[PDB]
Amino acid sequence: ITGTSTVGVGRGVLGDQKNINTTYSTYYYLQDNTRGNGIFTYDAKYRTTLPGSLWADADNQFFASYDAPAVDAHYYAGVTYDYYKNVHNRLSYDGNNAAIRSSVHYSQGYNNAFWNGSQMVYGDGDGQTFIPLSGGIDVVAHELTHAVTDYTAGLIYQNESGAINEAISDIFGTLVEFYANKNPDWEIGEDVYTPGISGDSLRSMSDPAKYGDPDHYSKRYTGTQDNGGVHINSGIINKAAYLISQGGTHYGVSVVGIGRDKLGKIFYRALTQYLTPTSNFSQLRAAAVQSATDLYGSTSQEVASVKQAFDAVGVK
Ligand SMILES: [Ca+2]
Ligand SMILES: [Ca+2]
Ligand SMILES: [Ca+2]
Ligand SMILES: [Ca+2]
Ligand SMILES: [Zn+2]
């Protein structure tokens, strides 16, 4: 919409008060003119057709129960944009300030959220397995990384190449979650997963085998389900990348953590400079080893920790 930029006030999925950038033209639309070519949040209106109608509001207050997912999708979209712009100096996902569009209230009881090659899609969840999936900041940032990966490494979405893609979106989903400092942790989607149960999550980068994901390359999934298990073998790279940031010993292999910021630096450079559409885990190791060398030197500790954490997960 061509209209006046403004700030609206609304409530998130988890009930937190927020301020959302909106654009006023007769209605208040959930359109952010402050970042890039615009951040747009649509109402799918419980249907599959996308993107739907740009979210409209008569009074610029978004405290309705129906608005709760839209506010989180529009607000956390601006957060993940801020991370890539401030932490990696990348303007939107294509590097050219591309417009960011999300569609909330997707389908009915849909327990998933995904980047379909063009925009963000958020189901509302059935209320038991999931609540509205835009509520978790790591959920938004994760699927937003898929937009980033599409324009850089372009890792195909099957086998190990897809498992790296999934893990890349998990790392940068957690790193954005730490960027907002919004009760951060190394789990995946604990905010919108099983509201009746507490202390559980969809995945775990610290403990992937806590929910049955392989934490070692020997334990990887080699079948054909889940497009070769790209959501399954993401636990190997998650365990690798988390040891990079934090350290510790995995299967008798010690790793000296270099912190979140250096890990976030290493994988992004590897993502946009060295990784290819058909990269496998070993090629990822060479890319992460090569990227740390550029940023820190071959004789530096950051290269050493990358070599150690990949040895810990058995990636050679
Ligand atoms: Ca309203
Ligand atoms: Ca949290
Ligand atoms: Ca999380
Ligand atoms: Ca839970
Ligand atoms: Zn994903």
PDB file of C-alpha atoms and ligand atoms in Angstrom:
ATOM      1  CA  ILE A   1       0.000   0.000   0.000  1.00  0.00           C
ATOM      2  CA  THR A   2       1.087   3.565  -0.718  1.00  0.00           C
ATOM      3  CA  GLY A   3       0.436   5.334   2.557  1.00  0.00           C
ATOM      4  CA  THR A   4       1.761   6.894   5.725  1.00  0.00           C
ATOM      5  CA  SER A   5       4.291   4.917   7.744  1.00  0.00           C
ATOM      6  CA  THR A   6       3.414   4.603  11.425  1.00  0.00           C
ATOM      7  CA  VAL A   7       3.835   2.468  14.544  1.00  0.00           C
ATOM      8  CA  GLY A   8       1.027   0.296  15.862  1.00  0.00           C
ATOM      9  CA  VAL A   9       0.668  -1.396  19.259  1.00  0.00           C
ATOM     10  CA  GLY A  10      -0.403  -5.010  19.599  1.00  0.00           C
ATOM     11  CA  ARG A  11      -0.126  -8.325  21.398  1.00  0.00           C
ATOM     12  CA  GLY A  12       1.911 -11.359  20.372  1.00  0.00           C
ATOM     13  CA  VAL A  13       1.122 -15.059  20.342  1.00  0.00           C
ATOM     14  CA  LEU A  14       2.346 -15.435  23.935  1.00  0.00           C
ATOM     15  CA  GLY A  15       0.473 -12.337  25.126  1.00  0.00           C
ATOM     16  CA  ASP A  16       3.414  -9.924  25.222  1.00  0.00           C
ATOM     17  CA  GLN A  17       2.800  -6.271  24.393  1.00  0.00           C
ATOM     18  CA  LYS A  18       4.558  -5.112  21.228  1.00  0.00           C
ATOM     19  CA  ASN A  19       4.962  -2.200  18.833  1.00  0.00           C
ATOM     20  CA  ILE A  20       4.608  -2.986  15.128  1.00  0.00           C
ATOM     21  CA  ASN A  21       5.477  -0.850  12.119  1.00  0.00           C
ATOM     22  CA  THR A  22       2.315  -0.319  10.074  1.00  0.00           C
ATOM     23  CA  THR A  23       1.323   1.726   7.026  1.00  0.00           C
ATOM     24  CA  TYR A  24      -1.827   3.853   7.094  1.00  0.00           C
ATOM     25  CA  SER A  25      -3.986   4.285   3.993  1.00  0.00           C
ATOM     26  CA  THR A  26      -7.690   4.304   4.928  1.00  0.00           C
ATOM     27  CA  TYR A  27      -6.889   1.153   6.916  1.00  0.00           C
ATOM     28  CA  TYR A  28      -3.838   0.371   8.991  1.00  0.00           C
ATOM     29  CA  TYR A  29      -1.920  -2.350   7.159  1.00  0.00           C
ATOM     30  CA  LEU A  30       0.749  -4.585   8.718  1.00  0.00           C
ATOM     31  CA  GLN A  31       3.326  -3.208   6.285  1.00  0.00           C
ATOM     32  CA  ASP A  32       6.773  -2.068   7.423  1.00  0.00           C
ATOM     33  CA  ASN A  33       8.403   0.667   5.330  1.00  0.00           C
ATOM     34  CA  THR A  34      11.388   1.070   7.675  1.00  0.00           C
ATOM     35  CA  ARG A  35      13.373  -1.962   6.456  1.00  0.00           C
ATOM     36  CA  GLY A  36      14.334  -2.635   2.871  1.00  0.00           C
ATOM     37  CA  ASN A  37      11.645  -2.851   0.201  1.00  0.00           C
ATOM     38  CA  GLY A  38       9.050  -3.522   2.895  1.00  0.00           C
ATOM     39  CA  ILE A  39       7.904  -6.165   5.373  1.00  0.00           C
ATOM     40  CA  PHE A  40       4.400  -7.441   4.624  1.00  0.00           C
ATOM     41  CA  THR A  41       2.215  -9.740   6.721  1.00  0.00           C
ATOM     42  CA  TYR A  42      -0.846 -11.268   5.069  1.00  0.00           C
ATOM     43  CA  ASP A  43      -3.954 -12.985   6.395  1.00  0.00           C
ATOM     44  CA  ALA A  44      -4.379 -16.359   4.700  1.00  0.00           C
ATOM     45  CA  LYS A  45      -7.823 -16.546   6.368  1.00  0.00           C
ATOM     46  CA  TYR A  46      -7.570 -20.292   7.088  1.00  0.00           C
ATOM     47  CA  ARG A  47      -7.064 -21.082   3.380  1.00  0.00           C
ATOM     48  CA  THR A  48      -4.266 -22.472   1.228  1.00  0.00           C
ATOM     49  CA  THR A  49      -4.338 -19.678  -1.373  1.00  0.00           C
ATOM     50  CA  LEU A  50      -1.389 -17.326  -0.891  1.00  0.00           C
ATOM     51  CA  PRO A  51      -0.543 -14.748   0.155  1.00  0.00           C
ATOM     52  CA  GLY A  52      -4.083 -13.632   0.915  1.00  0.00           C
ATOM     53  CA  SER A  53      -5.085 -10.131   1.984  1.00  0.00           C
ATOM     54  CA  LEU A  54      -2.564  -7.702   3.421  1.00  0.00           C
ATOM     55  CA  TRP A  55      -3.478  -7.474   7.095  1.00  0.00           C
ATOM     56  CA  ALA A  56      -5.856  -4.562   7.685  1.00  0.00           C
ATOM     57  CA  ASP A  57      -6.825  -2.903  10.956  1.00  0.00           C
ATOM     58  CA  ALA A  58      -9.363  -0.160  11.620  1.00  0.00           C
ATOM     59  CA  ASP A  59      -7.851   1.305  14.814  1.00  0.00           C
ATOM     60  CA  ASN A  60      -4.104   0.437  14.591  1.00  0.00           C
ATOM     61  CA  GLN A  61      -4.473  -1.610  17.801  1.00  0.00           C
ATOM     62  CA  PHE A  62      -3.841  -5.315  17.301  1.00  0.00           C
ATOM     63  CA  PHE A  63      -5.008  -6.830  20.596  1.00  0.00           C
ATOM     64  CA  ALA A  64      -7.569  -9.219  19.095  1.00  0.00           C
ATOM     65  CA  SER A  65      -7.049 -12.957  19.572  1.00  0.00           C
ATOM     66  CA  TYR A  66      -7.048 -13.288  15.783  1.00  0.00           C
ATOM     67  CA  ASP A  67      -4.307 -10.646  15.490  1.00  0.00           C
ATOM     68  CA  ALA A  68      -1.911 -12.380  17.906  1.00  0.00           C
ATOM     69  CA  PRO A  69      -0.136 -14.509  15.236  1.00  0.00           C
ATOM     70  CA  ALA A  70      -0.045 -11.688  12.676  1.00  0.00           C
ATOM     71  CA  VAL A  71       1.712  -9.336  15.097  1.00  0.00           C
ATOM     72  CA  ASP A  72       4.383 -11.945  15.845  1.00  0.00           C
ATOM     73  CA  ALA A  73       4.927 -12.777  12.178  1.00  0.00           C
ATOM     74  CA  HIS A  74       5.240  -9.090  11.274  1.00  0.00           C
ATOM     75  CA  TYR A  75       7.370  -8.207  14.313  1.00  0.00           C
ATOM     76  CA  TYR A  76       9.776 -11.162  14.300  1.00  0.00           C
ATOM     77  CA  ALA A  77      10.170 -10.625  10.553  1.00  0.00           C
ATOM     78  CA  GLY A  78      11.646  -7.218  11.354  1.00  0.00           C
ATOM     79  CA  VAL A  79      13.847  -8.817  14.012  1.00  0.00           C
ATOM     80  CA  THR A  80      15.429 -11.369  11.674  1.00  0.00           C
ATOM     81  CA  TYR A  81      15.937  -8.606   9.110  1.00  0.00           C
ATOM     82  CA  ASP A  82      17.688  -6.567  11.806  1.00  0.00           C
ATOM     83  CA  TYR A  83      19.986  -9.492  12.615  1.00  0.00           C
ATOM     84  CA  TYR A  84      21.135 -10.062   9.034  1.00  0.00           C
ATOM     85  CA  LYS A  85      21.522  -6.316   8.465  1.00  0.00           C
ATOM     86  CA  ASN A  86      23.364  -5.574  11.719  1.00  0.00           C
ATOM     87  CA  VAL A  87      25.282  -8.812  12.363  1.00  0.00           C
ATOM     88  CA  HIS A  88      26.129  -9.793   8.768  1.00  0.00           C
ATOM     89  CA  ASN A  89      25.437  -6.559   6.823  1.00  0.00           C
ATOM     90  CA  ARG A  90      23.036  -8.399   4.509  1.00  0.00           C
ATOM     91  CA  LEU A  91      20.031  -6.426   3.260  1.00  0.00           C
ATOM     92  CA  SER A  92      17.114  -8.890   3.388  1.00  0.00           C
ATOM     93  CA  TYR A  93      17.528 -12.458   2.129  1.00  0.00           C
ATOM     94  CA  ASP A  94      18.681 -11.769  -1.446  1.00  0.00           C
ATOM     95  CA  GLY A  95      21.197  -9.102  -0.412  1.00  0.00           C
ATOM     96  CA  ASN A  96      19.218  -6.444  -2.317  1.00  0.00           C
ATOM     97  CA  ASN A  97      16.647  -5.419   0.331  1.00  0.00           C
ATOM     98  CA  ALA A  98      14.034  -7.786  -1.118  1.00  0.00           C
ATOM     99  CA  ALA A  99      10.524  -7.445   0.281  1.00  0.00           C
ATOM    100  CA  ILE A 100       9.627  -9.866   3.082  1.00  0.00           C
ATOM    101  CA  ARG A 101       6.103 -11.295   2.990  1.00  0.00           C
ATOM    102  CA  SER A 102       4.431 -13.584   5.518  1.00  0.00           C
ATOM    103  CA  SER A 103       1.000 -15.221   5.508  1.00  0.00           C
ATOM    104  CA  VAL A 104      -0.551 -16.067   8.865  1.00  0.00           C
ATOM    105  CA  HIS A 105      -3.641 -18.150   9.683  1.00  0.00           C
ATOM    106  CA  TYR A 106      -2.593 -20.623   7.001  1.00  0.00           C
ATOM    107  CA  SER A 107      -4.906 -23.605   6.472  1.00  0.00           C
ATOM    108  CA  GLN A 108      -6.815 -25.020   9.456  1.00  0.00           C
ATOM    109  CA  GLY A 109      -4.991 -26.624  12.358  1.00  0.00           C
ATOM    110  CA  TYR A 110      -1.803 -26.575  10.282  1.00  0.00           C
ATOM    111  CA  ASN A 111       1.086 -27.565  12.578  1.00  0.00           C
ATOM    112  CA  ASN A 112       3.901 -26.236  10.379  1.00  0.00           C
ATOM    113  CA  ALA A 113       5.581 -23.088   9.079  1.00  0.00           C
ATOM    114  CA  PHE A 114       7.698 -22.910   5.944  1.00  0.00           C
ATOM    115  CA  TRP A 115       9.350 -20.792   3.258  1.00  0.00           C
ATOM    116  CA  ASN A 116       7.808 -21.883  -0.063  1.00  0.00           C
ATOM    117  CA  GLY A 117      10.478 -20.328  -2.296  1.00  0.00           C
ATOM    118  CA  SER A 118       8.844 -16.880  -2.236  1.00  0.00           C
ATOM    119  CA  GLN A 119       7.413 -15.924   1.173  1.00  0.00           C
ATOM    120  CA  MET A 120       6.763 -16.983   4.759  1.00  0.00           C
ATOM    121  CA  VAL A 121       3.861 -19.270   5.683  1.00  0.00           C
ATOM    122  CA  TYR A 122       2.623 -19.793   9.247  1.00  0.00           C
ATOM    123  CA  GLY A 123      -0.074 -22.212  10.276  1.00  0.00           C
ATOM    124  CA  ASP A 124      -1.937 -21.616  13.507  1.00  0.00           C
ATOM    125  CA  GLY A 125      -1.370 -25.062  15.011  1.00  0.00           C
ATOM    126  CA  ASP A 126      -4.071 -27.335  16.423  1.00  0.00           C
ATOM    127  CA  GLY A 127      -3.715 -25.876  19.929  1.00  0.00           C
ATOM    128  CA  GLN A 128      -2.194 -29.127  21.239  1.00  0.00           C
ATOM    129  CA  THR A 129       0.848 -30.025  19.117  1.00  0.00           C
ATOM    130  CA  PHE A 130       1.467 -26.365  18.224  1.00  0.00           C
ATOM    131  CA  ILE A 131       0.090 -22.918  18.951  1.00  0.00           C
ATOM    132  CA  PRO A 132       0.408 -20.254  16.160  1.00  0.00           C
ATOM    133  CA  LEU A 133       3.875 -20.973  14.787  1.00  0.00           C
ATOM    134  CA  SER A 134       4.827 -17.308  14.378  1.00  0.00           C
ATOM    135  CA  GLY A 135       5.015 -17.128  18.182  1.00  0.00           C
ATOM    136  CA  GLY A 136       8.519 -18.580  18.405  1.00  0.00           C
ATOM    137  CA  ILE A 137      11.217 -16.206  17.215  1.00  0.00           C
ATOM    138  CA  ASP A 138      13.516 -19.089  16.282  1.00  0.00           C
ATOM    139  CA  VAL A 139      10.664 -20.496  14.177  1.00  0.00           C
ATOM    140  CA  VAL A 140      10.437 -17.256  12.189  1.00  0.00           C
ATOM    141  CA  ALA A 141      14.200 -16.804  11.821  1.00  0.00           C
ATOM    142  CA  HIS A 142      14.723 -20.455  10.859  1.00  0.00           C
ATOM    143  CA  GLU A 143      12.331 -20.429   7.908  1.00  0.00           C
ATOM    144  CA  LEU A 144      13.614 -16.955   7.031  1.00  0.00           C
ATOM    145  CA  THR A 145      17.120 -18.409   6.702  1.00  0.00           C
ATOM    146  CA  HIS A 146      15.654 -20.678   4.014  1.00  0.00           C
ATOM    147  CA  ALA A 147      15.116 -17.488   2.026  1.00  0.00           C
ATOM    148  CA  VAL A 148      18.774 -16.626   2.690  1.00  0.00           C
ATOM    149  CA  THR A 149      20.010 -20.097   1.711  1.00  0.00           C
ATOM    150  CA  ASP A 150      17.971 -20.034  -1.520  1.00  0.00           C
ATOM    151  CA  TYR A 151      19.962 -17.069  -2.851  1.00  0.00           C
ATOM    152  CA  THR A 152      23.426 -18.094  -1.593  1.00  0.00           C
ATOM    153  CA  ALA A 153      24.443 -21.757  -1.155  1.00  0.00           C
ATOM    154  CA  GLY A 154      21.241 -23.050  -2.743  1.00  0.00           C
ATOM    155  CA  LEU A 155      21.624 -26.424  -1.015  1.00  0.00           C
ATOM    156  CA  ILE A 156      19.238 -28.913  -2.603  1.00  0.00           C
ATOM    157  CA  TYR A 157      16.588 -30.074  -0.144  1.00  0.00           C
ATOM    158  CA  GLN A 158      17.412 -33.798  -0.013  1.00  0.00           C
ATOM    159  CA  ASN A 159      20.038 -36.035   1.612  1.00  0.00           C
ATOM    160  CA  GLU A 160      22.996 -34.398   3.381  1.00  0.00           C
ATOM    161  CA  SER A 161      22.706 -31.180   1.362  1.00  0.00           C
ATOM    162  CA  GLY A 162      19.196 -30.665   2.716  1.00  0.00           C
ATOM    163  CA  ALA A 163      20.312 -31.647   6.212  1.00  0.00           C
ATOM    164  CA  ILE A 164      22.918 -28.875   6.110  1.00  0.00           C
ATOM    165  CA  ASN A 165      20.210 -26.469   4.913  1.00  0.00           C
ATOM    166  CA  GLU A 166      17.988 -27.526   7.816  1.00  0.00           C
ATOM    167  CA  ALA A 167      20.861 -27.154  10.286  1.00  0.00           C
ATOM    168  CA  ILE A 168      21.880 -23.774   8.847  1.00  0.00           C
ATOM    169  CA  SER A 169      18.327 -22.549   9.413  1.00  0.00           C
ATOM    170  CA  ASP A 170      18.439 -23.986  12.945  1.00  0.00           C
ATOM    171  CA  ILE A 171      21.722 -22.252  13.826  1.00  0.00           C
ATOM    172  CA  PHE A 172      20.696 -18.853  12.468  1.00  0.00           C
ATOM    173  CA  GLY A 173      17.243 -19.392  13.955  1.00  0.00           C
ATOM    174  CA  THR A 174      18.864 -19.780  17.371  1.00  0.00           C
ATOM    175  CA  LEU A 175      21.348 -16.969  16.706  1.00  0.00           C
ATOM    176  CA  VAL A 176      18.532 -14.552  15.862  1.00  0.00           C
ATOM    177  CA  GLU A 177      16.725 -15.787  18.977  1.00  0.00           C
ATOM    178  CA  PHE A 178      19.861 -14.875  20.922  1.00  0.00           C
ATOM    179  CA  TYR A 179      20.025 -11.564  19.043  1.00  0.00           C
ATOM    180  CA  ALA A 180      16.659 -10.521  20.477  1.00  0.00           C
ATOM    181  CA  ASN A 181      17.684 -11.940  23.883  1.00  0.00           C
ATOM    182  CA  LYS A 182      14.078 -13.189  24.102  1.00  0.00           C
ATOM    183  CA  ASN A 183      14.639 -15.908  26.725  1.00  0.00           C
ATOM    184  CA  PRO A 184      17.257 -17.497  24.446  1.00  0.00           C
ATOM    185  CA  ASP A 185      18.310 -21.137  24.411  1.00  0.00           C
ATOM    186  CA  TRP A 186      19.684 -23.787  22.058  1.00  0.00           C
ATOM    187  CA  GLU A 187      16.364 -25.599  21.599  1.00  0.00           C
ATOM    188  CA  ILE A 188      14.115 -25.221  18.544  1.00  0.00           C
ATOM    189  CA  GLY A 189      10.583 -23.871  18.802  1.00  0.00           C
ATOM    190  CA  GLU A 190       9.996 -24.346  22.529  1.00  0.00           C
ATOM    191  CA  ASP A 191       7.769 -21.250  22.466  1.00  0.00           C
ATOM    192  CA  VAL A 192       5.062 -22.707  20.208  1.00  0.00           C
ATOM    193  CA  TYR A 193       5.475 -26.449  20.865  1.00  0.00           C
ATOM    194  CA  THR A 194       3.016 -28.394  23.067  1.00  0.00           C
ATOM    195  CA  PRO A 195       1.476 -25.738  25.354  1.00  0.00           C
ATOM    196  CA  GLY A 196       0.266 -28.372  27.816  1.00  0.00           C
ATOM    197  CA  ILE A 197       3.791 -29.756  28.296  1.00  0.00           C
ATOM    198  CA  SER A 198       6.664 -27.579  29.501  1.00  0.00           C
ATOM    199  CA  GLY A 199      10.409 -27.776  29.039  1.00  0.00           C
ATOM    200  CA  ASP A 200      10.271 -29.659  25.732  1.00  0.00           C
ATOM    201  CA  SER A 201      11.068 -28.534  22.202  1.00  0.00           C
ATOM    202  CA  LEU A 202      10.783 -29.560  18.565  1.00  0.00           C
ATOM    203  CA  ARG A 203      14.549 -30.117  18.247  1.00  0.00           C
ATOM    204  CA  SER A 204      17.661 -29.682  20.387  1.00  0.00           C
ATOM    205  CA  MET A 205      20.985 -28.360  19.138  1.00  0.00           C
ATOM    206  CA  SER A 206      22.593 -29.033  22.525  1.00  0.00           C
ATOM    207  CA  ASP A 207      21.151 -32.570  22.772  1.00  0.00           C
ATOM    208  CA  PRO A 208      19.816 -33.721  19.382  1.00  0.00           C
ATOM    209  CA  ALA A 209      19.438 -37.340  20.505  1.00  0.00           C
ATOM    210  CA  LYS A 210      17.215 -36.139  23.357  1.00  0.00           C
ATOM    211  CA  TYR A 211      14.384 -36.339  20.796  1.00  0.00           C
ATOM    212  CA  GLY A 212      16.002 -39.096  18.723  1.00  0.00           C
ATOM    213  CA  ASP A 213      17.994 -36.976  16.269  1.00  0.00           C
ATOM    214  CA  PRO A 214      21.515 -38.291  15.549  1.00  0.00           C
ATOM    215  CA  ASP A 215      24.209 -36.339  17.374  1.00  0.00           C
ATOM    216  CA  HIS A 216      26.946 -38.202  15.470  1.00  0.00           C
ATOM    217  CA  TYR A 217      27.650 -38.840  11.796  1.00  0.00           C
ATOM    218  CA  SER A 218      27.732 -42.588  12.461  1.00  0.00           C
ATOM    219  CA  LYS A 219      24.171 -42.312  13.811  1.00  0.00           C
ATOM    220  CA  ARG A 220      22.804 -40.477  10.761  1.00  0.00           C
ATOM    221  CA  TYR A 221      19.671 -41.555   8.897  1.00  0.00           C
ATOM    222  CA  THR A 222      20.423 -43.181   5.530  1.00  0.00           C
ATOM    223  CA  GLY A 223      16.882 -44.107   4.447  1.00  0.00           C
ATOM    224  CA  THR A 224      14.596 -42.347   1.985  1.00  0.00           C
ATOM    225  CA  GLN A 225      11.973 -40.913   4.353  1.00  0.00           C
ATOM    226  CA  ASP A 226      11.833 -37.149   4.942  1.00  0.00           C
ATOM    227  CA  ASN A 227      13.668 -36.567   1.645  1.00  0.00           C
ATOM    228  CA  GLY A 228      16.585 -38.545   3.043  1.00  0.00           C
ATOM    229  CA  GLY A 229      16.102 -37.222   6.571  1.00  0.00           C
ATOM    230  CA  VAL A 230      17.045 -33.579   6.134  1.00  0.00           C
ATOM    231  CA  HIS A 231      15.200 -32.822   9.389  1.00  0.00           C
ATOM    232  CA  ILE A 232      16.922 -35.842  10.982  1.00  0.00           C
ATOM    233  CA  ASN A 233      20.594 -35.421  10.055  1.00  0.00           C
ATOM    234  CA  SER A 234      20.351 -31.727  10.933  1.00  0.00           C
ATOM    235  CA  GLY A 235      21.117 -32.905  14.479  1.00  0.00           C
ATOM    236  CA  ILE A 236      24.680 -33.800  13.500  1.00  0.00           C
ATOM    237  CA  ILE A 237      25.482 -30.311  12.222  1.00  0.00           C
ATOM    238  CA  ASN A 238      23.486 -28.750  15.068  1.00  0.00           C
ATOM    239  CA  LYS A 239      25.628 -30.697  17.534  1.00  0.00           C
ATOM    240  CA  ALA A 240      28.726 -29.630  15.601  1.00  0.00           C
ATOM    241  CA  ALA A 241      27.793 -25.937  15.422  1.00  0.00           C
ATOM    242  CA  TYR A 242      26.722 -25.825  19.077  1.00  0.00           C
ATOM    243  CA  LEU A 243      30.044 -27.311  20.206  1.00  0.00           C
ATOM    244  CA  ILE A 244      31.718 -24.596  18.118  1.00  0.00           C
ATOM    245  CA  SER A 245      29.901 -21.875  20.041  1.00  0.00           C
ATOM    246  CA  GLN A 246      29.953 -23.435  23.514  1.00  0.00           C
ATOM    247  CA  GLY A 247      32.529 -26.214  23.669  1.00  0.00           C
ATOM    248  CA  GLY A 248      32.632 -29.327  25.781  1.00  0.00           C
ATOM    249  CA  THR A 249      33.301 -32.974  25.031  1.00  0.00           C
ATOM    250  CA  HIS A 250      31.234 -35.089  22.628  1.00  0.00           C
ATOM    251  CA  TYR A 251      32.066 -38.817  22.482  1.00  0.00           C
ATOM    252  CA  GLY A 252      35.444 -38.222  24.115  1.00  0.00           C
ATOM    253  CA  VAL A 253      36.382 -35.362  21.755  1.00  0.00           C
ATOM    254  CA  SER A 254      36.995 -32.025  23.465  1.00  0.00           C
ATOM    255  CA  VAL A 255      36.120 -28.737  21.751  1.00  0.00           C
ATOM    256  CA  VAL A 256      37.014 -25.224  22.936  1.00  0.00           C
ATOM    257  CA  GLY A 257      33.963 -23.076  22.259  1.00  0.00           C
ATOM    258  CA  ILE A 258      34.661 -19.744  20.570  1.00  0.00           C
ATOM    259  CA  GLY A 259      31.314 -18.102  21.356  1.00  0.00           C
ATOM    260  CA  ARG A 260      28.101 -17.517  19.438  1.00  0.00           C
ATOM    261  CA  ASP A 261      29.394 -14.503  17.496  1.00  0.00           C
ATOM    262  CA  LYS A 262      32.393 -16.293  15.980  1.00  0.00           C
ATOM    263  CA  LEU A 263      30.270 -19.328  15.075  1.00  0.00           C
ATOM    264  CA  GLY A 264      27.700 -17.022  13.498  1.00  0.00           C
ATOM    265  CA  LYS A 265      30.521 -15.369  11.570  1.00  0.00           C
ATOM    266  CA  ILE A 266      32.056 -18.660  10.428  1.00  0.00           C
ATOM    267  CA  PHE A 267      28.927 -20.349   9.090  1.00  0.00           C
ATOM    268  CA  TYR A 268      27.586 -17.255   7.311  1.00  0.00           C
ATOM    269  CA  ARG A 269      30.819 -16.751   5.373  1.00  0.00           C
ATOM    270  CA  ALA A 270      30.895 -20.481   4.625  1.00  0.00           C
ATOM    271  CA  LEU A 271      27.218 -20.258   3.656  1.00  0.00           C
ATOM    272  CA  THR A 272      27.603 -17.394   1.177  1.00  0.00           C
ATOM    273  CA  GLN A 273      31.183 -17.958  -0.047  1.00  0.00           C
ATOM    274  CA  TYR A 274      31.959 -21.692  -0.111  1.00  0.00           C
ATOM    275  CA  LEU A 275      28.835 -23.865   0.143  1.00  0.00           C
ATOM    276  CA  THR A 276      27.272 -25.107  -3.104  1.00  0.00           C
ATOM    277  CA  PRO A 277      23.849 -26.593  -4.009  1.00  0.00           C
ATOM    278  CA  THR A 278      25.085 -30.188  -3.603  1.00  0.00           C
ATOM    279  CA  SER A 279      27.411 -29.749  -0.617  1.00  0.00           C
ATOM    280  CA  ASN A 280      27.671 -32.693   1.776  1.00  0.00           C
ATOM    281  CA  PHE A 281      28.737 -32.709   5.420  1.00  0.00           C
ATOM    282  CA  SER A 282      32.432 -33.227   4.651  1.00  0.00           C
ATOM    283  CA  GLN A 283      32.363 -30.342   2.165  1.00  0.00           C
ATOM    284  CA  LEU A 284      30.682 -28.273   4.875  1.00  0.00           C
ATOM    285  CA  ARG A 285      33.611 -29.107   7.165  1.00  0.00           C
ATOM    286  CA  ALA A 286      36.084 -27.941   4.520  1.00  0.00           C
ATOM    287  CA  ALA A 287      33.981 -24.807   4.016  1.00  0.00           C
ATOM    288  CA  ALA A 288      33.792 -24.060   7.746  1.00  0.00           C
ATOM    289  CA  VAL A 289      37.518 -24.759   8.111  1.00  0.00           C
ATOM    290  CA  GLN A 290      38.227 -22.507   5.122  1.00  0.00           C
ATOM    291  CA  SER A 291      36.001 -19.698   6.412  1.00  0.00           C
ATOM    292  CA  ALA A 292      37.524 -19.595   9.899  1.00  0.00           C
ATOM    293  CA  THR A 293      40.976 -19.414   8.291  1.00  0.00           C
ATOM    294  CA  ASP A 294      40.009 -16.271   6.369  1.00  0.00           C
ATOM    295  CA  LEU A 295      38.424 -14.610   9.405  1.00  0.00           C
ATOM    296  CA  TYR A 296      40.888 -15.762  12.074  1.00  0.00           C
ATOM    297  CA  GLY A 297      43.943 -17.401  10.478  1.00  0.00           C
ATOM    298  CA  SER A 298      44.878 -21.047   9.981  1.00  0.00           C
ATOM    299  CA  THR A 299      46.973 -21.047  13.189  1.00  0.00           C
ATOM    300  CA  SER A 300      44.103 -19.563  15.246  1.00  0.00           C
ATOM    301  CA  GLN A 301      41.931 -21.222  17.888  1.00  0.00           C
ATOM    302  CA  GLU A 302      38.756 -20.649  15.853  1.00  0.00           C
ATOM    303  CA  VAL A 303      40.006 -22.960  13.099  1.00  0.00           C
ATOM    304  CA  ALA A 304      41.036 -25.491  15.753  1.00  0.00           C
ATOM    305  CA  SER A 305      37.600 -25.565  17.389  1.00  0.00           C
ATOM    306  CA  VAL A 306      35.952 -26.065  13.988  1.00  0.00           C
ATOM    307  CA  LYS A 307      38.244 -29.018  13.307  1.00  0.00           C
ATOM    308  CA  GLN A 308      37.568 -30.446  16.776  1.00  0.00           C
ATOM    309  CA  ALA A 309      33.775 -30.119  16.705  1.00  0.00           C
ATOM    310  CA  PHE A 310      33.532 -31.839  13.319  1.00  0.00           C
ATOM    311  CA  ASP A 311      35.749 -34.661  14.593  1.00  0.00           C
ATOM    312  CA  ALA A 312      33.410 -34.958  17.587  1.00  0.00           C
ATOM    313  CA  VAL A 313      30.401 -35.602  15.339  1.00  0.00           C
ATOM    314  CA  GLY A 314      32.544 -37.874  13.175  1.00  0.00           C
ATOM    315  CA  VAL A 315      32.447 -35.580  10.132  1.00  0.00           C
ATOM    316  CA  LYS A 316      35.690 -35.940   8.175  1.00  0.00           C
TER     317      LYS A 316
HETATM  318 CA    CA B   1      -7.934  -3.794  16.053  1.00  0.00          CA
HETATM  319 CA    CA B   2      12.848 -19.221  25.146  1.00  0.00          CA
HETATM  320 CA    CA B   3      14.589 -21.743  20.652  1.00  0.00          CA
HETATM  321 CA    CA B   4       6.124 -27.050  25.426  1.00  0.00          CA
HETATM  322 ZN    ZN B   5      13.485 -25.764   7.717  1.00  0.00          ZN
END
